[PDB]
Write a protein that binds this ligand. Structure first.
Ligand SMILES: Nc1nc2c(ncn2[C@@H]2O[C@H](COP(=O)(O)OP(=O)(O)O)[C@@H](O)[C@H]2O)c(=O)[nH]1
Lengths: 41, 428
């Protein structure tokens, strides 16, 4: 309504990976055993 | 800690395995009921190396009895100390073995390995920290020599880091308890050259004379020879089970004994050994024990020290004694008869000691020596093997079990490569 025929038609990332990151291995942990074997038990 | 596990495979194994557990059960003051009836707290301190606490305060062994034709097991199931075993730790097959290495290693063996391995692991985890295995053999037979090594080839691959001892009974030099003793020997020895950390060799011949000459026994029953074998097998773990002013664990005994990974064929003895009469004549001092232990009679194997050169040696004394005496004694021996010992080793003995003697004695000893005269047995047997294999006598029995002839020559060459190892290091 405002005589704006120019305004009539409008014409116009990887997350990251931490350094600490790592899978827990059965070492550096005093709660459990300290080996990994195929079919021991 | 330092838990062991004991295997008894064969007729010999199942029988000397009886006397063995008969001795240890007394040594720790436990009755065949399985209850403890000793006096000291010292008995219960390291009992967990051989037993397993149960409900109501019982102690049952951690042995594994494996044998075809459970007949000989029905005996030990009925002996005085037959109530202590877990009935589950009994592995038996309804078929005979035939004093044949093949079927004990290929056909009948392969049908029970599923059970035996499922048995050994039930207790290889009951140990907080497993020390190593321990077996008993009969190299002439088929059960002890076929299933024995077959189980070992399995043991070595799931537990290579740990140690496995072997009190194998070897064939006799003059008499032959079996007509197919050679084939069962080499085919087993070839298995023992690759899959064994330590291997004593005991012969039924030397056990007789020691029971005849030294012990003056009139009728030596096999129950008496195994009161000897039991004596030495108990004499190895005295550092494990009991304190000592110089302890010596099982591992530090091999490291200190075998210079090369193949020369693990030892020679044992036990002292003191006197008749009922001579007990009142000879004193019990450290110079006495070392005089009889170094002798060429107490060698339970039929190999003469005065023919080869001692690579190393050992001694496990038991009793409140003077650790100066043992050291100067074992030094004098190397000093006087200084040709029986190699020269590229300055001092080639170890000397343990323990505060605790046997239950009835005050001072005892135990000997282990790795000589180069052991090559003689493998020479006497490698001749009998190649004698009859050259004409193929009794071979249709072995080949009938899917065996071949390469599995023979491999066994022989691997033995002849071992007899040379014991010759280079014999510089006369
Ligand atoms: N110290 C001792 N050795 C035995 C005894 N019985 C058999 N042996 C040896 O066992 C050897 C035969 O092997 P054996 O175990 O009986 O038959 P296998 O089941 O086929 O292995 C023979 O050389 C016997 O001398 C025993 O009661 N005491």
């Amino acid at each position: 309504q405002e005589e704006s025929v120019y305004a009539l038609i409008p014409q116009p990332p990887a997350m990251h990976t931490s350094k600490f990151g790592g899978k827990t291995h059965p070492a550096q942990f005093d709660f459990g055993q300290n080996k990994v074997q195929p079919h021991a038990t | 800690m330092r838990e062991i596990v004991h295997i008894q495979g064969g007729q010999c194994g199942n029988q000397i395995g009886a006397k063995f557990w008969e001795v240890v059960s007394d040594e720790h003051g436990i009755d065949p009921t399985g209850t403890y009836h000793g006096d000291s707290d010292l008995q219960l301190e390291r009992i967990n190396v051989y037993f397993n606490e149960a409900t109501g305060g019982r102690y049952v062994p951690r042995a594994i009895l494996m044998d075809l034709e459970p007949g000989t097991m029905d005996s030990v199931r009925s002996g005085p100390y037959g109530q202590i075993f877990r009935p589950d730790n009994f592995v038996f097959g309804q078929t005979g073995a035939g004093n044949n290495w093949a079927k004990g290693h290929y056909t009948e063996g392969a049908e029970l390995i599923d059970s035996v391995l499922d048995v050994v692991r039930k207790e290889a985890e009951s140990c907080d920290c497993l020390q190593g295995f321990q077996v008993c053999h009969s190299l002439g037979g088929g059960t002890g020599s076929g299933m024995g090594t077959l189980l070992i080839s399995k043991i070595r691959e799931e537990y290579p880091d740990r140690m496995m001892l072997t009190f194998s009974v070897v064939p006799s030099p003059k008499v032959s308890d079996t007509v197919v003793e050679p084939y069962n020997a080499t085919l087993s020895v070839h298995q023992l050259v690759e899959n064994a950390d330590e291997c004593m060799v005991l012969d039924n011949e030397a056990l007789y004379d020691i029971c005849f000459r030294t012990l003056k026994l009139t009728t030596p029953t096999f129950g008496d020879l195994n009161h000897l074998i039991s004596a030495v097998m108990s004499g190895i773990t005295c550092c494990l089970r009991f304190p000592g002013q110089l302890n010596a664990d099982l591992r530090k005994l091999a490291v200190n004994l075998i210079p090369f990974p193949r020369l693990h064929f030892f020679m044992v003895g036990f002292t003191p050994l006197t008749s009922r009469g001579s007990q009142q004549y000879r004193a019990l001092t450290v110079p006495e024990l070392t005089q009889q232990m170094w002798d060429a009679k107490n060698m339970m194997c039929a190999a003469d020290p005065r023919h080869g050169r001692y690579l190393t040696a050992s001694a496990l004394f038991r009793g409140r004694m003077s650790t100066k005496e043992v050291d100067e004694q074992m030094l004098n021996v190397q000093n006087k008869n200084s040709s029986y010992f190699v020269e590229w080793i300055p001092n080639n003995v170890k000397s343990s000691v323990c505060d605790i003697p046997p239950k009835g004695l005050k001072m005892s000893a135990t000997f282990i020596g790795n000589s180069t005269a052991i090559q003689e047995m493998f020479k006497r047997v490698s001749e009998q093997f190649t004698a009859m294999f050259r004409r193929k006598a009794f071979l249709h029995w072995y080949t009938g079990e899917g065996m071949d002839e390469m599995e023979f020559t491999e066994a022989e060459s691997n033995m002849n490569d071992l007899v040379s190892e014991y010759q280079q290091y014999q510089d006369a």
